[PDB]
């Protein structure tokens, strides 16, 4: 009996399991894979009807429009801790966790086929109406929280107080405005109709999203566990994790669902992720005089002196003697440095 | 002068299902052309291929469907020969799915307008079959491990159906405790079981969904398609046991009767699974058989739990290697687990 | 101490949501049982009464 | 054991601010990225 052909080398599994697996001492070329889902927070009108919105307000004033908090979709957010790379690099190099490859896939797509779920009757003796209308899908992977832009419409609407809205809207806020920024740090309070990602600031995340508005369009879903969405930039780095944290934020609205009396309401589903990780060799950016800067300022007493910084200074004149030279036939001269060279006026 | 013919994989044996157990060389190929039956429910009066009419106005408080009204996934099995003959310690010799090819059978059956459709307008034809489609198939060496998702937890299912357990509001979201296997044709309803995207290292599934009230169904038929089932490492769905599992389900849209009742419709599906032989590490050494020898005979012990949610093993220190004495006995690893952050 | 405080969905603890955390370091011959289970009888099934 | 690599070169950031960065003299190979609104 001849021996078989010798097999093909693959990367070696070392530990599978729960969340307590990340605490393993590995070598340098370690790679991990983290499978995680997020809940959709569509509003939850009671405890019994999880994952929906409440019945919609049909027509209010353009001025006295006052919704309630139980009927707004919101962005779902979460934070994954990571363990330290407590390592031994020379000349101030560090090691931080990079998130190379994402792969998203919507969970629960065939719940919408259930037509006998209390819809309004579509014709004489027919079945139930499926979910159709404006869909929305949005997810984001990065080492920093999703810094997002303020945009709303109809600024004269009075939000309820469970939500976080842009502060002090004007008529100018309905287009690109600067003074309506916020971070994303609180689940089920950031409404979908009031925030979009800021294209200016996020050097560290990657957001993907698409939108289709309509009275009645079919929601198209697409499920495949061989798709692979790449997260590299032009230079070759993904999201770095500055602090040991990994911020994943996502939100999904599938469409409009009609109840038994004929009221449209919203529908959300969950979302799956699979972030692959790796160790990058980065360098230190900040100066050496930083640790001490804070260490002294949390031990020495606070002094309420007579001030010496800013437009209320009481220093008259400062001089910096450095090096030597010949006698200047004028002692009342003034010498300084303009932008790069040594200049001297009268 | 002409030109000496070019080379081509010298075809060998051919025939029915009993061809498989004939042993071949080491670099064999195999091509398996097989299909499946769609399970749409099949009411009565030999209308094998529809469903019964759908319910109209069941409220959320109490739902009472029947076994007929729910379509189900279709699954089957292909027996295979084994390949090792003697012991041959070291390495084994398994099968591998490489290239699938799918094609829907009977797609021009929808052009019938002299059927019992609704009269679409006063002197025209009838209404063809329209609405939501959901086409889905899967090829793997293992049963298709799937995730439990539903809406309206107050549905009481019929007892012929394999349906998830203890319905709560947590079942309307991605829940962790609705895992199961797919081991039975015509029992898993399609409105209650998506494929689990987490657990499938030996199963590739493809599915394109399009809901809507009345959208056109778009179908292809072409014998030049080719879908590679290799991964990014260079393997396909391996065959651990001597089997190859095929699972699929085809919905085509809703049919309208002449009076107004809606009822479902589906079709069969083709497969052409090219297989071949590979060389892996043995997953069944003599040491695995030895432990399964003793663990059959030894007495059952039923004590307090030592695994799971109510476990009692607390802290396990698996340490081997040595290192310079640390300046802290209990070193901490996470920098700030819970978070004492800004603002 | 200088990043924003997020309070989102609990990715640690009793009701944590992360499920499958692989870790790799090296190389290995191709395992013909991909869901590499280790405990040959973790439950206690198939034993003698 | 095994040693992690050295970093990989990326182009250096030099300056950033409001619209009044558009007054500073630059080198020869100075490659801006102007973000704006309409």
XYZ file of C-alpha atoms in Angstrom, chain A residues 176-318:
143
model
C -25.031 71.471 5.841
C -24.321 73.169 9.170
C -21.253 72.901 11.385
C -22.546 73.554 14.908
C -24.592 70.320 15.191
C -21.914 67.701 15.880
C -22.098 64.786 18.315
C -20.496 61.465 19.130
C -22.402 58.179 19.292
C -22.347 56.841 22.842
C -25.871 55.910 23.946
C -28.114 53.174 22.584
C -31.736 53.785 21.534
C -31.540 57.578 21.743
C -29.946 58.712 18.473
C -32.823 58.808 15.958
C -32.355 57.782 12.343
C -33.938 60.902 10.884
C -31.552 63.326 12.584
C -27.995 62.061 12.063
C -25.876 60.861 9.138
C -22.112 60.126 9.200
C -19.765 63.081 8.881
C -17.609 62.703 5.748
C -14.966 65.098 7.074
C -13.648 63.622 10.319
C -13.539 59.813 10.280
C -10.036 58.793 9.276
C -10.359 55.665 11.381
C -13.724 54.005 10.690
C -15.337 52.609 7.537
C -19.075 53.095 7.162
C -21.206 51.552 4.422
C -24.832 52.334 3.731
C -27.558 52.597 1.144
C -31.031 54.071 1.021
C -34.161 53.772 -1.082
C -37.204 55.871 -0.352
C -40.560 54.891 -1.773
C -44.253 54.427 -1.229
C -44.023 50.741 -2.160
C -40.821 49.075 -3.371
C -39.707 45.477 -2.724
C -37.011 45.037 -0.064
C -34.170 43.127 -1.692
C -32.000 41.036 0.616
C -28.923 39.059 -0.330
C -27.478 36.272 1.828
C -24.236 34.372 1.112
C -21.500 33.124 3.413
C -18.721 33.436 0.850
C -18.829 37.227 0.385
C -15.843 39.164 1.696
C -15.781 42.935 2.224
C -12.282 44.395 2.495
C -11.386 47.273 4.846
C -8.009 48.552 3.655
C -7.148 52.129 2.690
C -4.722 53.391 0.036
C -1.684 52.872 2.251
C -2.473 49.415 3.625
C -3.959 49.902 7.096
C -7.449 49.199 8.310
C -9.039 50.625 11.396
C -6.467 50.903 14.137
C -7.588 50.727 17.761
C -6.005 53.714 19.522
C -7.326 52.690 22.892
C -7.930 48.990 23.409
C -11.557 49.128 22.328
C -13.439 48.282 19.148
C -16.544 50.318 18.344
C -19.120 48.611 16.150
C -22.265 50.544 15.249
C -25.010 49.478 12.888
C -28.676 50.081 12.110
C -31.196 48.371 9.791
C -34.725 49.291 8.737
C -36.420 46.812 6.426
C -39.732 48.405 5.484
C -43.322 49.096 6.420
C -45.696 46.551 7.955
C -49.473 46.965 7.892
C -51.488 45.971 10.949
C -55.039 44.638 11.104
C -56.822 48.003 11.167
C -54.580 49.198 8.344
C -51.732 51.057 10.049
C -48.208 50.983 8.662
C -45.379 50.503 11.096
C -41.681 49.835 10.889
C -39.570 46.677 10.894
C -35.981 45.982 11.853
C -33.806 42.893 11.844
C -30.490 41.930 13.374
C -27.067 42.040 11.758
C -24.090 39.708 11.898
C -20.395 40.606 11.789
C -17.085 38.784 11.553
C -14.078 41.010 12.167
C -10.681 39.490 11.503
C -7.854 40.976 13.569
C -4.057 41.198 13.513
C -1.117 42.963 15.226
C 0.464 45.994 13.533
C 3.809 47.569 14.323
C 3.164 51.292 14.734
C 5.382 54.076 16.029
C 4.822 56.594 18.809
C 3.466 59.989 17.657
C 3.302 62.095 20.837
C 6.441 63.480 22.565
C 8.206 62.074 25.637
C 7.041 64.968 27.817
C 3.442 63.790 28.149
C 3.291 61.271 30.986
C 4.987 63.761 33.310
C 2.701 66.549 32.082
C -0.274 64.797 33.660
C 1.566 63.183 36.584
C 2.645 66.505 38.068
C -0.738 68.118 37.462
C -2.620 65.591 39.624
C -0.449 65.964 42.752
C 0.661 69.595 43.127
C -1.818 72.043 44.656
C -3.965 74.380 42.581
C -2.878 77.992 43.036
C -5.175 80.979 42.471
C -2.404 83.393 41.560
C -2.653 86.722 39.856
C -2.887 85.566 36.274
C -0.045 85.290 33.776
C -1.587 83.700 30.682
C -3.578 85.412 27.955
C -4.869 88.945 27.499
C -4.722 89.696 31.220
C -0.984 89.099 31.593
C 1.206 91.180 33.869
C 4.593 90.176 32.480
C 6.115 93.277 30.911
C 9.003 92.014 28.765
C 10.820 88.702 28.310
